[PDB]
Amino acid sequence: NREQVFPTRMTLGLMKTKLKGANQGYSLLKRKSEALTKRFRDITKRIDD
Amino acid sequence: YGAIYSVSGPVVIAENMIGCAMYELVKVGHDNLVGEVIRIDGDKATIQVYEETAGLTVGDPVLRTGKPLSVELGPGLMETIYDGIQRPLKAIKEESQSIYIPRGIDTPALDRTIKWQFTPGKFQVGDHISGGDIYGSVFENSLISSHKILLPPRSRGTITWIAPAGEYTLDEKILEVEFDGKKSDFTLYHTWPVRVPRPVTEKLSADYPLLTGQRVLDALFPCVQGGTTCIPGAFGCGKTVISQSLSKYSNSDAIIYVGCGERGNEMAEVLMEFPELYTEMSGTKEPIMKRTTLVANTSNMPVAAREASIYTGITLAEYFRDQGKNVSMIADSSSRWAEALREISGRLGEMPADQGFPAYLGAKLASFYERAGKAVALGSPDRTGSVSIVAAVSPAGGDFSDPVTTATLGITQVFWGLDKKLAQRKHFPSINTSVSYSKYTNVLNKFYDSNYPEFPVLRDRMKEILSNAEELEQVVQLVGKSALSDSDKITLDVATLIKEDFLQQNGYSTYDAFCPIWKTFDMMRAFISYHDEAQKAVANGANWSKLADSTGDVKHAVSSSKFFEPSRGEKEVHGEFEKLLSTMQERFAE
Amino acid sequence: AVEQGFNVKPRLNYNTVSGVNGPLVILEKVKFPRYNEIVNLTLPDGTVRQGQVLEIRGDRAIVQVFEGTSGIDVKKTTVEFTGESLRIPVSEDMLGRIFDGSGRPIDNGPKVFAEDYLDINGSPINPYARIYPEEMISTGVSAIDTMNSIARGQKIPIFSASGLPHNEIAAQICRQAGLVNFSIVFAAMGVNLETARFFKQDFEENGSLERTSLFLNLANDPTIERIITPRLALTTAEYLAYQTERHVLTILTDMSSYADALREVSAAREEVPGRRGYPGYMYTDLSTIYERAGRVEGRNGSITQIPILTMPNDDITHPIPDLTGYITEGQIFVDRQLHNKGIYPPINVLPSLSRLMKSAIGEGMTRKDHGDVSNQLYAKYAIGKDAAAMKAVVGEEALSIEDKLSLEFLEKFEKTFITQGAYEDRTVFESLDQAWSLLRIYPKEMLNRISPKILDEFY
Amino acid sequence: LTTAEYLAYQTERHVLTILTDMSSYADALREVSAAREEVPGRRGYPGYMYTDLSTIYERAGRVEGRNGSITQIPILTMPNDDITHPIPDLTGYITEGQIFVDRQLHNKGIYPPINVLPSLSRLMKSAIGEGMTRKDHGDVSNQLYAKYAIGKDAAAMKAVVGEEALSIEDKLSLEFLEKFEKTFITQGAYEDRTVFESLDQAWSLLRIYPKEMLNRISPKILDEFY
């Protein structure tokens, strides 16, 4: 339930950078999933037509 | 004439030391070991011995010399190699005839066995001479044609007698000053307290740039003559290449390489290589040893000497600036200087502030870095010297997080940060573009407008490209880069081209050992013109993949722009770069 | 009423120096040592060095002499006790002068002809005698004056990194800032001598010194002088604003350097370092320095503060930014991402806010569209950053109209609004007109945070 | 070390000193420092540990008059595999170079479990290449280091995100990293690979890549050895 990181100030900064990047990637990928799902709904409607 | 009371490592407490003064050199023990009084309590004066304190016994006499840690400034130190204190290592080896440094060795800092040619200055008998005035000149080397003898600062009066032109040694009298009826005898040399900065009339603003030679340092984060740089210590090839590049091509009239806490064989490398280097500044090739004074202080040497080496080097540089020369003092391992200060504080019992470092670490680093800067040297004739401080900080934690790094960044003007990612890629010099900076861009805009008018806008464009592509590369590593605009693809491609051809350079390579300022400007012209023309073509409607397939030749040409030789001269090379981007514009029409 | 000044109090010259410890000079057989007393130490060489007492004991005073203890001799070191704490000779003519860390004028000019001698520490302002800030002090910086406008009497610091042009931004604010009387007070702590020369030459050349009382403390200047400098600037500000009825806008610089000086002073005593080496009472010290400002009831004068920190590792979790955010009333962030793109001033308006903006930006003050324009600009700038991140993920074409137009707005905003010439003076009205010019690329239906009436009138 | 100094300087021998458990030496120093009730330093280790470690380590090297050296190799043990610990940090400060033995590599089963990313040698650039061993030693070692760092970064990226997101260079670098840990670094005891054989094997590892992306290899050497 954690990462085997040696406690250090540099390691703390690296892990904060990792958390910020992961949050940014999570928001970006959630928005991309929403956009792709809108495109997918359009695609399936065109499939029915 | 006190007596030793307590010995515990370098810290020696000497009793009966009444009338002593803080930071006064005292000869501890029967071997006459150099020690600076760093604490006084009644008649007991705590002394830090600058040599090996093993063997000191209670009751050993301690002689008060009455003067602070003084460096012997004058002719004869322009080529020699010094310890932390101004101990001539070569003279010690010659006199002792051994590979060891004897304890309490009293070899004079400046050798008195050499006759120096002296030519008296414009001052004559009866004229009024003030501190720092020039009253002579000494032919030291071919490089140092005139080692102008300076009257010691804070010494003034009327010249009772001045010596004629002739070969005089340092012990021999040169000039006499009467002052308030007490005639003073002034020789070729003089001593100055390393702690006390050498006075100047006015500290001018540093304008002319210090050409480090490395392309990224010269373009994106420029340094000026008389500015602190804070190079990365050892991990990146920025320091290793930059030291020799500055010593060879920086146009500095003198160099004072200061290595505190330098590794043993890493100091042996410098002492065995610097004689071998040559420069082409004069008509014929001349050794760099004629222009450099090393303060060699290995980690084996005592911590007090490790702390004092930085002051010794900076005051030698201050002397050469007061002569009117442009100096670039290179401090190796200022991190080890700070560690030495921390160790001394621990010895004294002071309360550490931040990660063991003393609370006055910032104050000491500021009083050291503040000695730099262009200044009008005092006393007639009017002359304008400069001291650039190219200091190195070691990557304590692998990143700029140490207290010494924090203080240095707080008090510095230029900072070339280490990139662990770029170093692990063996991309040299490993200078992190994001964290690095240079506060001399605004002041250097004058020189850029005078010489290379488009330099500031070009470096700003390259910085913008690098930042935009860094953000885009973060997004790429996040989301796979499946979809990217043509403009974004050009941005990443141009940034990779820059980081591979412009920023990256081989210091040991013949072509890229020293990239001149005009060559760097031409390469920025080429790269920025390539990026701008590619962006314009993509905005027209051209497909980026096909355009890259067609313009691989132009990309290879702008990559080989790095391979362009600098020895061909500014006239021929610029003509080649003029033709390089002339055909580059036409190649994008298709 | 100041006839008590006409009094001669002789000073005791102590030749009894028990010992010397680092910066301290411990004396013995002191008659009646007063805590925080300015002391003139005379070296054996003859040089006179000022000092302050950090500890007091029965017939013993521990003087912390300025400029170090190099040369202090037990046998021959005269020590003269000025029977008072440090005091500055205030005057209405202090405007136009440049002072050192200890109050001595470093400009080649006469000593300030004192109207009074005020204690540098001052006294806490009575909360019952404090007023909420109402109007804005206009700053030439368009970003600050439009998105993070500063009220008359708040404390809004500028959070910057090591290399970011916080000093240049400070000089710009001092040169251009005014009312929309005024007397700027500038305090530079631990600045490089090049930066101090830049400040001095800039103010003399551009005439901003006419109303500026510049306090310069070099990096090589004593750390106790660095401690004294912000107290000097705030005492001058208190004098001018409250006993003269003028607005001040103190601009402190390098409060990180001030905190380093606090660390050095605390460890001069036996105080154990706190969280990050800084003393545990940094909260109290910063609170005093900051809350020295503010409006008051009976006096028609205000003091504003621009502390201007220097975040050490580009983090807010550091004690200096944390405490500064606790005491102060806003944040202005200078961003390395903006600085690396050549955008001056490199201020990003997303982390930056002024908590007291609603008071300053009003109808009687500024123009009546200020608040809505700033809110719309912030919302569209956030949307622009989101769309800039989104473009490299889902392609430029798949972005909505509200994302493509927002990308265009972001480009124009960063490259024309935030990007301000170092010597370009943009009044609040001109900055708001530029903001409206940026917003006009949007059709009136898209601007939703702006009130309908203002939207119909200004668009 | 004084025995080594004697044997190497006065008897003119070549001595290789193998001081082991310098971490235990530093623990002894901390025990003596703690008893003396002096100002600790970092993690209780004496503030003068840098000076003591420099006094020990700096007794290695060659002298001008006497042909004979102390090739000091002080084995050290990180308390928790952390470089940032005071003993390994100061040892890196003074002693030149470092051979990093990796717990991750040992767990994977590699011998020697030497991690070449933290491992460094300050004197390699001067003692390697240009006819001393071979023309391509330094460039090959730079290429290996760069591609190993690329492989580690690509492995981290492929663990965090999808494998297909990795580029062609990233996939080639993962293959290189596998063939590098499993074949090049992996060396049985008593194998005694010559430096030339190791260079040939490293080139065989570098022939995985097309000639185009061997960026840190000088083009002349790339043409003469690919």
* Residue count (chain C): 459
Q: How far apart are CA D106 and CA D102, in angstroms?
A: 6
Give how far Cα B6 sits from Cα of B12, B350, D26, D71, Å: 6, 18, 26, 38
Helices C319-327 and C282-291: crossing angle in degrees, nearest 10, is 40
Question: Which stretches does DSSP call E strand in B308-407?
Answer: 326-332, 352-354, 357-358, 375-377, 383-393
- Identify the H or E element spanning B259: strand B254-262
AA letter at B42: G
B300 contacts in D (CB within 8 Å)?
54-55, 58-59
Pairing, β C24-28 against β C60-65: antiparallel
CB–CB contacts below 8 A, B to C: 186
Q: How far apart are CA B234 and CA B214, in angstroms?
A: 16
* Contact flag A25-B401 (C-beta cutoff 8 Å): no
Query: Considering only CA atoms, which of C193, C32, D123 is closest in space to residue B204?
Result: C193
Resolution attained, angstroms: 3.3
Helices B486-497 and B517-540: crossing angle in degrees, nearest 10, is 160
B9 near D CB under 8 A: yes
Please tell me the distance in Å from B360's CA to the nearest CA on chain C: 6
Tokens of C383: 């949307």
AA letter at C354: S
Dihedral sign for Cα C158, C162, C163, C168, please: positive
Contact D54, D47 (CB under 8 A): no
Q: How far apart are CA B378 and CA B322, in angstroms?
A: 7
CA dihedral B447, B450, B456, B457 (to 10 degrees): 170
Residue B374 DSSP SS3: coil
Query: Considering only CA atoms, which of C149, C218, C213, C151 is closest in space to residue C190?
Result: C218
CB–CB contacts below 8 A, A to D: 7
Contact B537, B585 (CB under 8 A): no
Q: How far apart are CA C217 and CA C100, in angstroms?
A: 6
Q: How far apart are CA C336 and CA C339, in angstroms?
A: 5
* Contact flag C393-A28 (C-beta cutoff 8 Å): yes
Cis amide prior to B358 (ω within 30 degrees): no
Give how far Cα B426 sits from Cα of B240, B303, B429, D138, Å: 14, 34, 9, 11
- Identify the H or E element spanning B558: helix B544-560
Report phi then psi at C27, rounded to 5. Answer: -105, 165
Report phi then psi at D149, rounded to 5. Answer: -65, -40
Choose the mutation target among D37, D48, D135 for the interface with B, i.e. most B CBs under 10 Å: D48
Query: Considering only CA atoms, which of B326, B260, B170 is closest in space to residue D93?
Result: B260
Pairing, β B149-150 against β B134-138: antiparallel
Cis amide prior to B403 (ω within 30 degrees): no
Q: How far apart are CA C19 and CA C345, in angstroms?
A: 51
Query: Considering only CA atoms, which of C255, B82, B84, D21 is closest in space to residue B92?
Result: B82
Q: How far apart are CA B33 and CA B110, in angstroms?
A: 19
* DSSP structure class, residue B206: P
Within 8 A by CB and 6+ apart from B587, the residues are B550, B551, B553, B554
AA letter at C154: Q
Contact B254, B325 (CB under 8 A): yes
Interface subset of B 227-246, CB within 8 angstroms of C: 227
Neighbours of D201 (CB within 10 A): 14
Tokens of D195: 């430096």
- Identify the H or E element spanning B25: strand B25-28
Beta bridge partners of C182: C247
Residue B355 CB burial class (10 angstroms; 0-12, 13-18, ≥19): middle
- By CA distance, what is B395's nearest residue in A? A10
Contact C141, C103 (CB under 8 A): no
Among chain A, residues having any CB pair with chain D shorter than 8 Å are 6, 8, 10
Residue B297 DSSP SS3: strand
Residue B393 DSSP SS3: strand
C302: left (phi over 0), alpha (psi -120 to 50) or beta: beta
Breaks (C-N over 2.5 A) in chain D follow: none
Within 8 A by CB and 6+ apart from D172, the residues are D208, D209, D213
Within 8 A by CB and 6+ apart from C72, the residues are B21, B22, B40, C17, C20, C25, C41, C43, C65
Q: How far apart are CA C37 and CA C80, in angstroms?
A: 11
Query: Considering only CA atoms, which of C245, C320, C356, C289 is closest in space to residue C125?
Result: C289
Residue B377 DSSP SS3: strand
Say whether the C–A interface has 3 or more Cβ pairs within 8 Å. Answer: yes
Q: How far apart are CA C177 and CA C182, in angstroms?
A: 9
Please tell me the distance in Å from D169's CA to the nearest CA on chain A: 23
Q: Show the 3-state SS of C50-88.
A: EEEEEEEECCEEEEEECCCCCCCECCCCEEEECCCCCEE
Pairing, β C130-131 against β C295-296: antiparallel
Q: How far apart are CA C150 and CA C430, in angstroms?
A: 17
Q: How far is CA B153 from the centre of its chain?
A: 24
Interface subset of B 373-402, CB within 8 angstroms of C: 373, 400-401
Neighbours of B5 (CB within 10 A): 19
Report phi then psi at B349, rounded to 5. Answer: 95, 10
* Contact flag C394-A24 (C-beta cutoff 8 Å): no
Please tell me the distance in Å from B403's CA to the nearest CA on chain A: 12
* Contact flag A32-C313 (C-beta cutoff 8 Å): no
B406 contacts in C (CB within 8 Å)?
312-313
* Contact flag C390-A24 (C-beta cutoff 8 Å): no
Query: Considering only CA atoms, which of D172, D159, C355, C252 is closest in space to residue A3?
Result: D159
Q: How far apart are CA B297 and CA B83, in angstroms?
A: 5
* Contact flag D39-B352 (C-beta cutoff 8 Å): yes
Q: How far apart are CA B502 and CA B458, in angstroms?
A: 13
Contact B560, B508 (CB under 8 A): no
Give how far Cα C146 sits from Cα of B173, C376, C422, C426, Å: 71, 11, 17, 10
* DSSP structure class, residue B288: G
Tokens of C327: 């005491």
Q: How far apart are CA B44 and CA B13, in angstroms?
A: 6
Q: How far apart are CA B454 and CA B462, in angstroms?
A: 12
* DSSP structure class, residue B148: P
Output Rg (C-alpha) for chain B, integer angstroms: 27
Query: Considering only CA atoms, which of B491, B500, B484, B483 is closest in space to residue B467?
Result: B491
Please tell me the distance in Å from C411's CA to the nearest CA on chain A: 21
D153 near A CB under 8 A: no
AA letter at A12: L
* Residue count (chain D): 226
Residue B553 DSSP SS3: helix
AA letter at B451: N
Across the interface, of C260, C264, C393, the residue whose CB is closest to B483 is: C393
Within 8 A by CB and 6+ apart from A22, the residues are none
Within 8 A by CB and 6+ apart from B172, the residues are B163, B187, B188
Cis amide prior to B429 (ω within 30 degrees): yes
Report phi then psi at B370, rounded to 5. Answer: -80, -10
C342: left (phi over 0), alpha (psi -120 to 50) or beta: left
Pairing, β C309-310 against β C158-160: parallel
B471 contacts in C (CB within 8 Å)?
337, 388
Q: How far apart are CA C263 and CA C67, in angstroms?
A: 17
Pairing, β B326-332 against β B294-298: unpaired
D82 near A CB under 8 A: yes
Q: How far apart are CA C67 and CA B494, in angstroms?
A: 52
Output Rg (C-alpha) for chain C, integer angstroms: 25
Q: How far apart are CA B378 and CA B370, in angstroms?
A: 18
Interface subset of C 40-79, CB within 8 angstroms of B: 44, 69-76
Across the interface, of B399, B474, B479, the residue whose CB is closest to A10 is: B399
Cis amide prior to D112 (ω within 30 degrees): yes
Structure-determination technique = cryo-EM
Residue B319 CB burial class (10 angstroms; 0-12, 13-18, ≥19): buried
C350 near A CB under 8 A: no
Tokens of B386: 């400069």
- Angle value at C-alpha C121, between B350 and C263, nearest 5 degrees: 20
Report phi then psi at C230, rounded to 5. Answer: -65, -35
Q: How far apart are CA B371 and CA B377, in angstroms?
A: 13
- Angle value at C-alpha C455, between C449 and C459, nearest 5 degrees: 125
Considering all CA atoms of chain A, what is the largest pairwise distance in Å, rounded to the nearest integer? 60
Please tell me the distance in Å from C423's CA to the nearest CA on chain B: 13
Tokens of B590: 């298709």
Q: How far apart are CA B558 and CA B564, in angstroms?
A: 10
Dihedral sign for Cα B441, B446, B452, B458, please: positive
Report phi then psi at D132, rounded to 5. Answer: -65, -50
A29 contacts in D (CB within 8 Å)?
none
Query: Considering only CA atoms, which of B388, B385, B391, B354 is closest in space to residue B371?
Result: B388
Q: How far apart are CA C298 and CA C293, in angstroms?
A: 15
Report phi then psi at B522, rounded to 5. Answer: -65, -40
Residue B335 DSSP SS3: helix
Q: How far apart are CA B375 and CA B226, in angstroms?
A: 9
AA letter at C174: C
Interface subset of C 143-202, CB within 8 angstroms of B: 162-165, 168, 190, 192-194, 197-198
In chain B, count H helices and then E strands: 15, 31
Give how far Cα C210 sits from Cα of C185, C203, C214, Å: 11, 8, 10
Q: Show the 3-state SS of chain C.
A: CCHHHCCCCCCCEECCEEEEECCEEEEECCCCCCCCCEEEEECCCCCEEEEEEEEEECCEEEEEECCCCCCCECCCCEEEECCCCCEEEECHHHCCCEECCCCCECCCCCCCCCCEEEECCCCCCCHHHEECCCCEEECCCHHHHHHCCCECCCECCEEECCCCCHHHHHHHHHHHCEECCECCEEEEEEECHHHHHHHHHHHHHHCHHHHCEEEEEECCCCHHHHHHHHHHHHHHHHHHHHHHCCECCEEEECHHHHHHHHHHHHHHCCCCCCCCCCCCCHHHHHHHHHHCCCEECCCCCCCCECCCEECCCCCCCCHHHHHHHHHCCEEEEECHHHHCCCCCCCEEEEEEEECCHHHHCCCCCCCCCHHHHHHHHHHHHHHHHHHHHHHHHHCCCCCCHHHHHHHHHHHHHHHHHHCCCCCCCCCHHHHHHHHHHHHCCCCCCCCCCCCHHHHHHHC
Q: How far apart are CA C130 and CA C125, in angstroms?
A: 7
Q: How far apart are CA B454 and CA B451, in angstroms?
A: 9
Residue B147 DSSP SS3: coil
Q: Show the 3-state SS of chain D.
A: CHHHHHHHHHCCCCECCCCCCHHHHHHHHHHHHHHCCCCCCCCCCCCCHHHHHHHHHCCCCECCCCCCEECCCCCCCCCCCCCCCHHHHHHHHHCCCEEEECHHHHHHCCCCCEEEEEEECCCHHHHCCCCCCCCCHHHHHHHHHHHHHHHHHHHHHHHHCCHHHCCHHHHHHHHHHHHHHHHHHCCCCCCCCCHHHHHHHHHHHHCCCCHHHCCCCCHHHHHHHC
A25 contacts in B (CB within 8 Å)?
478-479
